[PDB]
Amino acid sequence: IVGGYTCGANTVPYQVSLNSGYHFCGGSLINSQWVVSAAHCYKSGIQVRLGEDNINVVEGNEQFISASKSIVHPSYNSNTLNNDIMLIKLKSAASLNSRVASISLPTSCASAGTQCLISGWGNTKSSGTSYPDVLKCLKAPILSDSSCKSAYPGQITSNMFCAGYLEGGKDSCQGDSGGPVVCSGKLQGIVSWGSGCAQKNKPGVYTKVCNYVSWIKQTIASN
Ligand SMILES: COc1cccc(CN)c1
Ligand SMILES: [Ca+2]
C-alpha cells in the first residue's frame, strides 16, 4: 500500500497473509474454513496466516493453517486477468474471535463513489521498494466505470472495478495482491492489477466480488 496508514494490530481481522515460505499475497477470510484471494496468487504449498500484524514476528494472535485445496475460477484468464478470483480451503477451521473474523460477502454491488478500505503488506513506494512488516491500510473510493475504462482503454471487463485516486500517490501495490477491498462491512473487491503503483491516471483495478457470490457459495457448499 502506497500512501496509506498503519492499520493497527488486528484491526482488520479478516485480512490474511498467504505464505509459501514468505508472504506472497493477501486474502480474506469469509468463513472459518475458507479464504478468497486472487487467481493470480495461485501456487502450491500455501499456508494461510491469520491474526497477523507484523508478518516477521510472532506476536501472539496468529493461527497458521495449511491449505488443503485451492480452486481457481473456471473462467480465469491469466492474460487479461478477467475473473481474477480463487478460493482456498483450510485444512482445519480457524478459531474465530475479535482478531480473527470472517468478512461477509456482498448482497449488492457497491457503486462508484462508495468509500472502501484496502489493506495489505505490499510495497509502500511508487518508485522504490520498501516492504512493511506491519499491515497497511488505505481508504479509497470506487471510481466510475467510465473513468476506469478511460484510464485503461481496452482492458476493463464487467468483472473489474477501479478504486483509488486519479491524481496518484495513494494505491495498492505488489504484495497487496489478493487482498481485500471492503466497503460498508462487505468484501466488494480483491486486489488484482494496475500499471505500477500510485501513478497519475493509473488507479488500482479490483476483481468485482459481487459478480461471484453465487459461484463462491455453491463452491463452498460442495467442497
Ligand atoms: C503492479 O503491481 C500491482 C499489484 C497489485 C496492485 C497494483 C495496483 N497499483 C499493482
Ligand atoms: Ca506475526
| First-last CA distance in the chain | 33
State yes or no: is 84 an active-site residue: yes
Q: Distance (Å, rounded) from C-alpha 212 to C-alpha 85?
A: 8
State yes or no: is 40 an active-site residue: yes
| 3 state DSSP class of 216 | helix
Task: Report the b/e string of 186-217 with b at 16+ CB within 10 A.
Answer: bbbbbbbbbeebbbeebbbbbbbbbbbeebbe
β-bridge pairing 115-120 and 47-50: unpaired
Cell of 49: 496466516
Listed residue (188, 18, 53, 199) closest to 115, CA to CA: 188
Which residues line the annotated binding site?
52, 54, 57, 62, 171-172, 174-175, 177
Q: How far is CA 80 from CA 24, 41, 83, 154, 155, in A?
A: 21, 15, 9, 10, 7
Give the Å distance between the CA of 215 and the centre of ligand 2.
Answer: 32
User: Mind listing the domains of the chain with CATH numbers?
Assistant: 1-12+103-210 (2.40.10.10), 13-102+211-222 (2.40.10.10)
β-bridge pairing 186-193 and 204-208: antiparallel
State yes or no: is 177 an active-site residue: yes
**Strand order in 115-120's β-sheet?**
5-6, 136-141, 115-120, 180-183, 186-193, 204-208, 160-163
Residue 202 CA, closest ligand 1 atom number: 9
Ligand closest in space to the Cα of 202: 1
CA angle 213, 189, 90 (to 5 degrees): 65
Q: What is the resolution of this structure in A?
A: 1.7
CB 98 within 8 A of CB 171: no
98: left (phi over 0), alpha (psi -120 to 50) or beta: alpha
CB 39 within 8 A of CB 73: yes
